[PDB]
Design a protein around this ligand. Sequence first.
Ligand SMILES: *[C@@H]1[C@H](O)[C@@H](O)[C@H](O)[C@@H](C(=O)O)[C@H]1NC(=O)CCCCCCCN=[N+]=[N-]
Ligand SMILES: *[C@@H]1[C@H](O)[C@@H](O)[C@H](O)[C@@H](C(=O)O)[C@H]1NC(=O)CCCCCCCN=[N+]=[N-]
Lengths: 457, 457
Amino acid sequence: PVRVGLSVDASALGHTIPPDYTGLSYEQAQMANPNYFSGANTQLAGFLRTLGRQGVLRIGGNTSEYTFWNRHAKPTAADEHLAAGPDKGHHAAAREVITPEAVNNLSEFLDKTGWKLIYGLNLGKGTPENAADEAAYVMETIGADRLLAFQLGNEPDLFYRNGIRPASYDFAAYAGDWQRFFTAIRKRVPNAPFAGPDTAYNTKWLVPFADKFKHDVKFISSHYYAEGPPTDPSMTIERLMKPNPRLLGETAGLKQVEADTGLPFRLTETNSCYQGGKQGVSDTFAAALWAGDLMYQQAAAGSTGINFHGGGYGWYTPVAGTPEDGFIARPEYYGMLLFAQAGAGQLLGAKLTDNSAAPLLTAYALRGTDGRTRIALFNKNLDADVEVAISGVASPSGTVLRLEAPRADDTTDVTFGGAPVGASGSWSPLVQEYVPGHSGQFVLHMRKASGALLEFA
Amino acid sequence: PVRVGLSVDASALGHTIPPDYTGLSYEQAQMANPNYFSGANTQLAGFLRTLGRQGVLRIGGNTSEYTFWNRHAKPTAADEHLAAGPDKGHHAAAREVITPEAVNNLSEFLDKTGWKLIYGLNLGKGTPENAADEAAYVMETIGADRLLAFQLGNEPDLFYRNGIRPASYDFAAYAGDWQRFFTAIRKRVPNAPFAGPDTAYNTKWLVPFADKFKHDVKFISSHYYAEGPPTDPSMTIERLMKPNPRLLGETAGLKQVEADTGLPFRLTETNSCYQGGKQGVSDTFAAALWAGDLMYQQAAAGSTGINFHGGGYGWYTPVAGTPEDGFIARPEYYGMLLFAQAGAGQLLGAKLTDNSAAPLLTAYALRGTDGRTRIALFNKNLDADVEVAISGVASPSGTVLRLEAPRADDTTDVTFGGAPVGASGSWSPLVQEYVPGHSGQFVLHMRKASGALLEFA
Ligand SMILES: *[C@@H]1[C@H](O)[C@@H](O)[C@H](O)[C@@H](C(=O)O)[C@H]1NC(=O)CCCCCCCN=[N+]=[N-]
Ligand SMILES: *[C@@H]1[C@H](O)[C@@H](O)[C@H](O)[C@@H](C(=O)O)[C@H]1NC(=O)CCCCCCCN=[N+]=[N-]
């Protein structure tokens, strides 16, 4: 093993993680099926509760430009069996209708989970008046306490690429659209909250959006995929475990926006690989390590939260399935589960030394809201075991829950705390293990391509 | 859908399925780790109970020629963490030692599960006297009620191919060995029960074995892999769903042995593809359909039982994992689960008609020991949905539990009764569905590459 030092500093205060930090993002097309986001969907509701007692459900995505609210519509027989996976971006999605029934059923789903809602409106192809009407029904049925924000279009900077607007569409044009929709909506719903611009940090769209619309939104909404442009070497597990300088830069950009406008930021759509994911990467244990680490990295940067995109049986979905067939936890879910068990609190200094031979090991220390110290570690080195000598924690007893699979590319065999997640998100730890050492010096071994959560008495 | 007819005949009596029909086979090398087959292994015990309240654990395999009992040995530190997956047959396995402690722990594992034991002795490379000593300790600790049989060597017809004996080793030579071992063992254990010859049906080994040793064994033990010789086109999902004429022939051969000697037969080692399995076939939902169907086909041929080979994280293992990391149900397990829920009873006539366009659909009807009619159906056609018109059942109510995954090659997303299996074999149905129709005419739809269990009131 590579022998590294980890030094915890209870005085090096970072950010406080909010209790609604975790979340999921889904395609708005899924709302065509009123059985999906329903009070009767107890299995899916159970998977969300396990991910956190508070969190945020975001509904939007490319399909939000192809979904059309109608106050008189009833779902058809095909609609009652629709499971809309992440949009693969290769062409126009099918047209779908959203019904009062689906909205009513969403409000019951949110009551069963305890989660809040970010809800997409159709700015790509709809009308301001139909958006106002949809926003009104959502506000009537869901309420201002569970409705966090509406968003007016998804990835407007990509409308051109995907046939929704002409090549010439730019931020100026988008700001005109945004204003027309904001104005119509606010007439019907004077207390409507908004977030935007619902894409990746950039200077042509995100920076001017925040300057112009800072008094009209509650927070900035940004997207992030670890996969870079279509021209890069395609994503591998190896690459996914390494730092992404684009991420660090886009995160800084978001912090500067915050400094300039007062607006906080949330990562409203993210996953490993775009266009639904890549088989052999996105659907593997490696995605658990990537996702768990990402949650922590963005939290330490001052992010208000996250929403991992998914649905259907897409390669990157945290939860897979249907109401007819049932739901299961995919490998990525286990990384979010580790964050769920750690809980909220305030991040602390945790400096790694002696680690140039194991450079993809990361570590985050947290003072829990219950007063206990926790450490989340991700050994993302694919070929190096580690031995971590831990100082700066005094406690009579540490325990470890391990995040494991037998290989980094496994599509199954994933456990946390020595147990799989069962039906309806059911999980409890079955193997807990004391961390050797004592107050001021603890010693933790970790295999290559594993994770761990340490909780100190 | 292809519209087919299924005609149940309560008068066309087949064989009665025994309550200990189900089972698993593992490598004897695994006995080096006393924590594996242990009373403390509650997770694995739970997966076996779910597969049936009675069944049989077989321990043997290629590693049984490389495992050496020693009455004074204690397990080492490496042994305490060994997880022995199926032997891949590419070379000699590592030498392993079996300890009293491992045997004691096995007896507690068997008490927790309610299963019986077939136990391998080392005829390949051991001595008669050490086999006698091992057989004595096993009989002392496990008892005659839970010990079903000892086996003297695994696949003796392949000893040559694999370096254990010379090219010239033949049945005559094997029969000499078998006799020397039988004689030594019976001196130490006068009531020792045996089964053999622990390979595939053939005329050079299995047929003469049964003639010569019929008064010395309780039953004939045969092996079957769907994959044929190394020279055949390699196994595909497509091929796995089709009838295997080798299987039908070897099964007939076993029935003729029974007629001639009075000896029943059990399939003591089977899976889809040999040498640990093939990735993309053995580890897929297709293996669930293949395994469930196989259980039924052999039961209808008059087999006393089955033992699916597995362990570790091998491609074909029903259950994967370790005591340190936990255990999970792989796709194949779900096929055996369907048989588990159906339960024991007596098989009935069930003739399919109008089915030349959906020729890989199979169906088995059973009068349960509780008096209710059940039908197990496997739609193994990869590209054809079916609509099954069912006659010859009178009942006020049928229900269906579905065996599903979104694609035949999926390595995960497998459900039964609308639920995954959870931790420690925990399973309950979450979606049950009434079968349309009434007494004398029921109508069941099934997707391509799915399965179903129908239970009639
Ligand atoms: C986010 C999107 O809103 C979802 O509908 C979609 O399913 C998801 C995904 O593709 O998996 C997300 N979309 C993207 O990340 C857009 C693709 C990234 C940029 C494409 C390359 C730029 N064009 N060129 N050349
Ligand atoms: C049964 C065996 O006892 C297990 O140890 C082994 O793990 C299992 C497997 O290979 O997965 C089973 N072994 C076999 O089925 C033997 C291979 C079949 C015949 C090989 C080809 C014949 N030789 N040539 N040429």
